[PDB]
């Protein structure tokens, strides 16, 4: 998965935050812009075969 310019997602989120009157931090970015990208990129993962078998209820076995 290729996110093209996360640096524009941060700007759209800044706009939303400044219109809701939230306190600006540095360069006017909201405080929680780290928690924005962090919980996005932490979905990229490699998951072991037991997690796959649990998720697909045994339909797929032995594959990460």
């Amino acid at each position: 998965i290729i996110y093209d310019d996360l640096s524009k997602q941060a700007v759209a989120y800044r706009q939303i935050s400044l219109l809701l009157r939230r306190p600006p931090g540095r360069e006017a970015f909201p405080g929680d812009v780290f928690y924005l990208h962090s919980r996005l990129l932490e979905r990229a993962a490699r998951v072991n075969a037991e997690y796959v078998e649990a998720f697909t209820k045994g339909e797929v076995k032995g594959k990460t």
């Binding site: 306190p23 600006p24 931090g25 540095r26 360069e27 006017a28």
Partner: protein, 284 residues
């Protein structure tokens, strides 16, 4: 950009300015030592030229090859160059003058051969494709006559072997501490000195064994001495040129600190303003 990167760059330019000031002072001392070693060379060549004058144009004269012209079918050049850079245009003015005159001679259809003293000219005339037949390199600031014997032996051997018809030394002349000039001067066949045969009748030598054998070695030693003198003058000229070039470079660095500081101040102010506005305009 940003005040910190510019402050780093200013630090490095100040350091460059320190280095070039040091090199200026070092060259300024080596120049005096070089022009002392230059003066210690004159007596030998002067008295040997008086002796050659006596044996050549005194009350008798000899048919030695080195003293009378012939048909120029090809020319030899002994090229003196510096072993070190940062001298400014010293080497390139010389090589351009040499190339012009070598072009003149090759227009008349006479080839030319080059013998190199110093490695800068060696690399240059290899890259330009000239004919380099012999070389000596890496003398630095300890030139010694024993290392010049090789190339001048090659060129003299090729002269009396008939394969050269004229021989030049191309080198800088340490005219004054502020001015050096490239000169190409002939040393074979022997230039007509400002001397008169009238003074010779006063006395003559007891030649042992005989004059014809002595005159040969006198002329060979004389040519060697003149190549050595040219080398030492080129070395003193190199020191002077490095001194003045490092003076210029230190002033060029100082005049650039004062531009970088305008940039730095502008960035300092800009950052203070932006930060303080981003604070006050976030409140309430």
């Amino acid at each position: 950009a940003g005040a910190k990167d510019i402050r780093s760059k200013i630090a490095s330019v100040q350091n460059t300015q320190k280095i070039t000031k040091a090199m200026e002072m070092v060259a300024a001392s080596k120049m005096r030592k070089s022009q002392d070693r230059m003066a210690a060379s004159r007596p030998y060549a002067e008295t040997m030229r008086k002796v050659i004058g006596h044996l050549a144009h005194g009350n008798l004269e000899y048919k030695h090859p080195y003293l009378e012209d012939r048909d120029v079918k090809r020319v030899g050049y002994l090229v003196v160059s510096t072993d070190r850079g940062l001298a400014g245009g010293l080497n390139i003015n010389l090589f351009k003058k040499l190339l012009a005159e070598m072009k003149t001679w090759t227009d008349k259809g006479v080839q030319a051969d080059l013998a190199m003293i110093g490695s800068k000219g060696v690399s240059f005339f290899n890259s330009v494709g000239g004919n380099v037949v012999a070389q000596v390199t890496g003398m630095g600031d300890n030139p010694s006559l024993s290392e010049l014997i090789g190339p001048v032996k090659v060129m003299l051997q090729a002269y009396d072997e008939g394969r050269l018809d004229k021989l030049y030394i191309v080198s800088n002349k340490f005219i004054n501490t502020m001015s050096q000039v490239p000169t190409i001067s002939q040393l074979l066949p022997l230039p007509a000195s400002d001397d008169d045969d009238l003074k010779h009748k006063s006395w003559d030598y007891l030649y042992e064994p005989d004059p014809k054998a002595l005159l040969d070695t006198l002329l060979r030693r004389y040519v060697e001495s003149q190549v050595y003198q040219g080398v030492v003058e080129n070395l003193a000229s190199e020191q002077a040129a490095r001194m003045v070039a490092m003076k210029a470079a230190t002033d060029n660095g100082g005049s650039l600190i004062k531009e970088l500081q305008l940039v730095y101040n502008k960035a300092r102010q800009a950052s203070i303003t932006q930060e303080l506005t981003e604070i006050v305009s976030g409140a309430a």
